[PDB]
Amino acid sequence: MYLRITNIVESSFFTKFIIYLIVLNGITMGLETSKTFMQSFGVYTTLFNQIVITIFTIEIILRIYVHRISFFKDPWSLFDFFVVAISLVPTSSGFEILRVLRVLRLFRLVTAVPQMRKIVSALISVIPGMLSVIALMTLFFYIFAIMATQLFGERFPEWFGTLGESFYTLFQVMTLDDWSNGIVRPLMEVYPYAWVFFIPFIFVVTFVMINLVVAIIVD
Amino acid sequence: MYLRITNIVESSFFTKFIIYLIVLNGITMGLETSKTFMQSFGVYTTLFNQIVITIFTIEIILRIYVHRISFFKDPWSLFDFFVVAISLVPTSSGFEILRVLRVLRLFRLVTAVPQMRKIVSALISVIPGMLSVIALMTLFFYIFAIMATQLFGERFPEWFGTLGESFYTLFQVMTLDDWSNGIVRPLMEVYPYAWVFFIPFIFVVTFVMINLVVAIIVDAMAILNQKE
Amino acid sequence: MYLRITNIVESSFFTKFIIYLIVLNGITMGLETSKTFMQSFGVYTTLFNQIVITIFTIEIILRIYVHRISFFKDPWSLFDFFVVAISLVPTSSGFEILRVLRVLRLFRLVTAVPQMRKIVSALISVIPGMLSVIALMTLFFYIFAIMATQLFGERFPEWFGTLGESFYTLFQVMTLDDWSNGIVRPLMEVYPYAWVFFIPFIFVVTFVMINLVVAIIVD
Amino acid sequence: MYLRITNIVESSFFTKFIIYLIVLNGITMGLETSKTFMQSFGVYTTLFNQIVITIFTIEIILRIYVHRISFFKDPWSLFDFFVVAISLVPTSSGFEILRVLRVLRLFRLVTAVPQMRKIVSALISVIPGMLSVIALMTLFFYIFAIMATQLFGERFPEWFGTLGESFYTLFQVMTLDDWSNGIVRPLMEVYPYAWVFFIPFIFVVTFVMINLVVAIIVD
Numbered sequence: 097m098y099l100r101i102t103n104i105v106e107s108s109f110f111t112k113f114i115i116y117l118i119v120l121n122g123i124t125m126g127l128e129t130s131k132t133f134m135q136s137f138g139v140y141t142t143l144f145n146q147i148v149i150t151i152f153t154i155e156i157i158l159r160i161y162v163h164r165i166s167f168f169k170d171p172w173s174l175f176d177f178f179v180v181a182i183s184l185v186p187t188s189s190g191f192e193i194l195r196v197l198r199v200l201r202l203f204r205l206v207t208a209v210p211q212m213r214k215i216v217s218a219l220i221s222v223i224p225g226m227l228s229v230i231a232l233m234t235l236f237f238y239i240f241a242i243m244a245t246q247l248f249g250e251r252f253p254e255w256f257g258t259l260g261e262s263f264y265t266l267f268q269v270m271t272l273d274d275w276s277n278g279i280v281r282p283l284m285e286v287y288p289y290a291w292v293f294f295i296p297f298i299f300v301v302t303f304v305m306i307n308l309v310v311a312i313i314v315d
Numbered sequence: 316m317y318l319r320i321t322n323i324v325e326s327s328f329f330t331k332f333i334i335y336l337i338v339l340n341g342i343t344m345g346l347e348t349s350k351t352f353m354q355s356f357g358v359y360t361t362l363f364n365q366i367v368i369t370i371f372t373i374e375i376i377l378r379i380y381v382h383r384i385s386f387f388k389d390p391w392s393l394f395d396f397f398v399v400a401i402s403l404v405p406t407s408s409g410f411e412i413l414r415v416l417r418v419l420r421l422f423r424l425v426t427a428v429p430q431m432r433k434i435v436s437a438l439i440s441v442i443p444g445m446l447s448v449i450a451l452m453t454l455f456f457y458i459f460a461i462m463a464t465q466l467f468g469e470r471f472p473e474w475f476g477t478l479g480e481s482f483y484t485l486f487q488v489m490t491l492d493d494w495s496n497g498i499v500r501p502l503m504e505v506y507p508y509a510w511v512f513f514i515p516f517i518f519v520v521t522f523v524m525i526n527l528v529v530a531i532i533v534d535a536m537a538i539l540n541q542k543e
Numbered sequence: 544m545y546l547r548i549t550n551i552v553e554s555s556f557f558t559k560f561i562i563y564l565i566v567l568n569g570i571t572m573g574l575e576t577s578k579t580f581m582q583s584f585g586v587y588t589t590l591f592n593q594i595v596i597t598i599f600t601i602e603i604i605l606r607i608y609v610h611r612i613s614f615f616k617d618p619w620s621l622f623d624f625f626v627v628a629i630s631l632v633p634t635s636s637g638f639e640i641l642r643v644l645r646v647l648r649l650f651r652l653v654t655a656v657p658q659m660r661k662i663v664s665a666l667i668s669v670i671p672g673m674l675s676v677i678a679l680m681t682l683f684f685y686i687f688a689i690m691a692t693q694l695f696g697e698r699f700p701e702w703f704g705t706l707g708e709s710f711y712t713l714f715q716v717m718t719l720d721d722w723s724n725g726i727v728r729p730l731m732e733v734y735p736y737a738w739v740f741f742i743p744f745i746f747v748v749t750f751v752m753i754n755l756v757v758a759i760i761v762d
Numbered sequence: 763m764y765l766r767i768t769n770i771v772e773s774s775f776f777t778k779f780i781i782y783l784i785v786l787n788g789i790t791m792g793l794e795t796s797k798t799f800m801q802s803f804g805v806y807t808t809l810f811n812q813i814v815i816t817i818f819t820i821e822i823i824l825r826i827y828v829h830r831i832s833f834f835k836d837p838w839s840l841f842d843f844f845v846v847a848i849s850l851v852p853t854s855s856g857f858e859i860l861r862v863l864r865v866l867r868l869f870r871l872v873t874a875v876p877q878m879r880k881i882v883s884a885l886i887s888v889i890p891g892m893l894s895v896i897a898l899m900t901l902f903f904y905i906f907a908i909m910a911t912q913l914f915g916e917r918f919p920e921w922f923g924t925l926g927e928s929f930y931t932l933f934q935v936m937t938l939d940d941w942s943n944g945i946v947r948p949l950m951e952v953y954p955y956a957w958v959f960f961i962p963f964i965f966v967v968t969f970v971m972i973n974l975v976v977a978i979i980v981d
């Protein structure tokens with residue numbers, strides 16, 4: 097019976113099945129939004145999700161006594177194991193933040209299609225060489241986030257009242273969200289010189305992300 | 316009669332005549348925008364529309380009698396057809412939008428003028444060299460558009476009321492438009508943990524698009540070498 | 544005498560001398576922008592300006608003697624010409640910009656100095672490569688501008704009232720400057736489908752801009 | 763006795779003793795941030811820092827002997843001398859921004875750890891190749907930065923008062939921060955053709971900003 101179930105799971109049709117059904121829940125989760133549909137077609141939907149989730153649980157189980165060691169030595173499987181388990185945690189308890197986390201099974205659709213796997217890995221390909229740069233960036237912030245909190249955060253706390261408030265803002269500025277009228281002009285009107293912070297900060301921090309796509313296109 | 320009309324079509328005149336009308340109608344359309352004009356020199360242009368449309372409607376039939384089966388298997392032709400024909404839509408009734416789609420006719424400057432046709436072909440070449448990632452986004456976007464509506468849109472109705480409003484808002488944040496003060500800071504006053512739906516939804520967005528583009532440079536770069 | 548006026552001009556002294564006048568008139572006008580400086584030194588500095596032109600005026604007469612027709616067959620020189628053709632014009636009457644166009648002079652730091660010439664004409668040299676596209680956009684821009692203008696200029700005339708409005712507003716959206724909340728959500732208050740003009744327009748324009756750079760990068 | 767102090771300073775323990783101190787006093791200054799942490803355990807914060815500055819002024823006097831002439835001709839040390847010197851000023855009088863610089867030391871985690879040094883110099887490196895077109899633009903940003911002050915400074919004072927106020931603004935227009943509604947849309951009410959002034963400017967400053975980026979990609 098070991099090899100009967102091995103053919104079962106690894107078949108074209110078990111794939112087409114699970115992929116058809118990832119697609120389906122992914123239209124019903126669409127329609128769940130509709131707060132009218134939830135009156136008209138409400139109940140079909142709520143247990144459709146339980147119907148589909150068990151299938152996935154067994155699809156996960158069927159996969160596991162086949163591969164064994166092999167299964168959890170795959171990132172995409174593990175994430176599927178991770179994702180559908182996230183949904184096995186009950187609707188009650190914990191936080192709602194578990195109810196809405198659930199909808200990460202649509203990433204399952206991604207892992208299910210090998211074309212997505214091909215391209216998604218190209219995207220994760222690129223990351224590590226940037227860990228060099230990436231994790232300096234993550235300190236320039238820390239250093240410069242602190243300077244702000246003490247400098248401003250008395251008078252302008254929403255923005256820099258805090259280690260973490262300074263971060264959220266310095267990010268804000270990094271992306272040049274609405275930093276000009278929104279964030280320095282109002283400061284200078286109290287602390288006239290804080291342009292010696294940000295114009296510098298804006299310089300370092302666009303520079304780096306520029307010499308990021310340069311040295312991204314060498315790999 | 317075929318090779319007689321097959322001569323009216325291909326002539327250096329007929330293209331220089333059809334094209335030079337496009338320009339001559341652009342100007343014309345650049346003046347249907349003051350009210351001043353439609354007052355004084357109004358019906359003047361009202362029917363100059365009606366002229367340059369007949370000139371095309373016929374022309375498409377001429378090429379259809381030349382190329383025929385060849386005509387509906389070229390993109391640039393199929394466009395001129397569609398775009399002329401959509402102008403054939405009637406002035407009265409219909410929909411007020413179809414009355415405004417007209418100045419798409421000014422796209423035949425692309426289609427007739429040769430150098431503009433070439434760039435378009437260049438520019439449309441990159442498309443499927445990305446079309447996986449184009450999808451990967453709308454899936455990702457989708458999984459993130461629900462997630463928004465069932466979190467925020469209860470309180471914050473305009474921004475995240477529906478699938479629709481969530482997507483559009485989630486686009487806004489992509490261009491990095493007003494996003495922090497304008498959309499998220501507000502979310503933080505009721506929901507201090509929204510910088511977890513967003514500072515990430517950011518990097519992911521701007522990791523991809525950067526790779527979407529280093530692709531464009533790469534696929535376009537990839538074609539250059541390796542021929543030795 | 545022709546071959547003295549050739550020698551006076553060609554000297555490595557002459558250039559240094561010209562570049563000295565510019566880089567003074569450069570410093571001098573920084574101080575002209577000030578409010579207080581023109582109280583005190585508004586005597587000398589209104590003098591000094593009128594010399595620096597008188598001299599460059601001579602320089603053009605001589606350099607024309609030297610190269611004759613080769614003068615108005617050279618870009619860089621014509622720029623020196625028309626920039627100085629401006630400053631001559633008397634101080635009062637007509638438009639107030641001709642008295643500000645004065646500062647256009649300072650760009651003689653570029654023409655005069657080789658390696659400013661080179662990197663400037665290195666920039667400009669891609670424009671011929673870009674006609675093939677600027678053409679197309681100004682066709683695209685002009686075309687949406689018409690549609691925008693009829694469709695919205697009735698309820699939103701400060702923004703889409705004429706062509707002019709529509710162009711700048713469309714020029715805005717292209718810089719993703721406050722397009723959404725600023726310009727479009729207000730439009731969705733009255734014309735709900737504007738996300739189908741404004742998004743897609745927004746797509747295309749950036750599309751181009753990327754592929755613009757992906758052939759500037761081969762070129 | 764000279765080569766005994768030259769055979770510890772160079773070792774891999776003396777080094778990891780700073781890099782670890784760095785990382786502790788690095789962690790400590792983010793705890794200062796907490797207002798709760800300053801009236802609970804502020805004592806060990808004041809001292810830990812106090813000891814660190816002892817260790818570091820010792821370290822630096824220790825590396826001066828081993829290195830001497832090799833020391834005061836290195837970037838990373840002239841950095842480290844001043845970056846630490848700053849924390850030794852009396853802390854009374856002067857300016858309170860003396861006291862804030864004290865966190866520029868946590869930059870040393872970059873100095874004293876070699877991968878960061880080669881990732882950091884991988885950016886300073888491609889800076890002498892750019893200081894050309896940093897000249898061309900800083901020229902433009904001046905020339906206009908005059909006109910702006912003298913086309914809109916009597917009435918549009920905040921944004922364009924002083925020469926400076928023209929700088930801080932045009933940069934915001936350059937960063938494309940809120941420019942159109944923020945800045946141009948308002949000027950246009952009083953002076954209508956300000957788009958002619960600004961809009962071109964926003965071609966020049968971004969074209970150059972794009973090609974100067976291409977000049978990075980082949981070199």
Ligand SMILES: COc1ccc([C@@H]2Sc3ccccc3N(CCN(C)C)C(=O)[C@H]2OC(C)=O)cc1
Pocket residue numbers: 270271272305489490491521717718719749938
């Ligand atoms: C954190 O680092 C960042 C921050 C922001 C960006 C945005 S991403 C974006 C999203 C959608 C359309 C375009 C953009 N572009 C490209 C086109 N744009 C230049 C006109 C950007 O450059 C960035 O926007 C700007 C001008 O800051 C990129 C990296």
Ligand SMILES: [Ca+2]
Pocket residue numbers: 273274493721939940
């Ligand atoms: Ca803004």
Ligand SMILES: [Ca+2]
Pocket residue numbers: 273491492493719720721722938939940
């Ligand atoms: Ca903006």
